[PDB]
């Protein structure tokens, strides 16, 4: 039999579940924060 | 606002409001100090803390202070000179930010320190009406 | 347990690569519990199975 490993080195990133879920947290945060700080600075401007 | 004092301590405040009927266009000699209602924000998330750090007018005594899951009260007065009926020639909105402790006693952690020239509104009280 | 020899009964440990190898130190703990079970014996009082 032939086992072909066409995984591209993801065996060697350790604790992949938490690592994946870090990356996803930091895009959702960085987006969500910057969407709220955007909306509020365009209701300040609209009041002043 | 009259303040009656005996032996150099306040006893009571008299608050009379008069009204000259007529037609005035004298907005250079006009002003209004209101004391706004006390606004309460529950800081749940880390965007709530970031939206608040956005605001130039949210001064903190220690900028490293942890806001997360704390409850904040904004005790705010706003002084306001005029230009016309609708446009303020100056806005000021100040007074202390307080955090609820686990006793339910509140304690001053911060200041509000909004200033401005020409303005069609007070952005602080708008922010706290929606968010608080 | 002679060094450079695996017992017949042994516990394993997951290595960061993700295989399970004979861990000597886990395996000792197990066999020491098993030595005492054999002399003194084990209780299961209050265990529900």
With CB atoms and an 8 Å threshold, state whether B50 touches A37.
yes
Shortest CA gap A44–chain B (Å): 5
Judging contact as 3 or more Cβ pairs under 8 Å, the answer for C and B is no
Distance CA B114, CA B73 (A): 16
Q: What is the resolution of this structure in A?
A: 2.9
List C21's β-bridge partners, or say none.
Answer: C13
In Å, how far are A31, B21, B121, B131 from B127, measured between CA atoms? Answer: 21, 35, 11, 6
Shortest CA gap C15–chain A (Å): 11
How many residues does the structure list for chain C? 49
Q: Which two tokens stand for residue C26?
A: 């886990």
With CB atoms and an 8 Å threshold, state whether A11 touches C16.
no
Cβ under 8 Å to B: A residues 7-46: 29, 32-33, 36-37, 40-41, 43-44
**Count of other CB atoms within 10 angstroms of residue B125:** 19
Cβ under 8 Å to A: B residues 39-68: 46-47, 50-51, 54-55
Distance CA B126, CA B132 (A): 10
Beta-carbon contacts of residue A8 (< 8 Å; ≥ 6 apart) = none
Q: Which two tokens stand for residue C25?
A: 């130190």
Contact B109, B97 (CB under 8 A): yes
Q: Which two tokens stand for residue B132?
A: 């608080």
List B41's β-bridge partners, or say none.
Answer: B72
Q: Which two tokens stand for residue B35?
A: 């004391």
SS3 call for B79: strand
List C12's β-bridge partners, or say none.
Answer: C22
**Count of other CB atoms within 10 angstroms of residue B123:** 22
Distance CA B9, CA A41 (A): 45
With CB atoms and an 8 Å threshold, state whether A11 touches C17.
yes
Mutate which: A35, A36, A38, A43, vs B, most B CBs within 10 A: A36
Tell me phi and psi for residue B103, to 5 degrees.
-85, -15
């Amino acid at each position: 039999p032939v086992m072909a490993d066409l995984n591209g080195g993801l065996q060697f990133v350790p604790e992949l579940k938490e690592f994946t879920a870090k990356l996803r947290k930091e895009l959702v945060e960085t987006s969500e924060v910057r969407k709220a700080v955007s909306i509020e600075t365009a209701l300040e401007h609209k009041v002043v | 606002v009259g303040t009656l004092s005996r032996n150099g301590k306040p006893v009571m405040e008299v608050t009379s409001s008069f009204f000259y009927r007529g037609n005035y266009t004298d907005f250079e000699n006009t002003f209004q100090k209101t004391v706004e209602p006390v606004y309460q924000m529950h800081i749940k998330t880390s965007k709530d803390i970031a939206v608040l750090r956005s605001k130039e007018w949210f001064q903190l005594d220690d900028e490293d202070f942890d806001l997360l899951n704390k409850t904040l009260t904004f005790e705010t007065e706003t002084e306001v000179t005029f230009k016309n009926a609708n446009i303020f020639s100056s806005v000021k909105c100040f007074g202390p930010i307080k955090v609820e402790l686990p006793t339910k006693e509140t304690v001053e952690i911060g200041i509000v320190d909004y200033e401005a020239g020409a303005s069609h509104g007070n952005p602080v009280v708008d922010f706290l009406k929606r968010n608080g | 347990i002679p060094r450079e020899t695996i017992p017949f009964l042994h516990l394993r440990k997951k290595t960061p690569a993700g295989d399970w190898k004979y861990d000597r130190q886990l395996s000792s703990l197990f066999l020491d519990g098993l030595e005492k079970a054999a002399f003194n014996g084990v209780t299961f009082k209050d265990k529900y199975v």
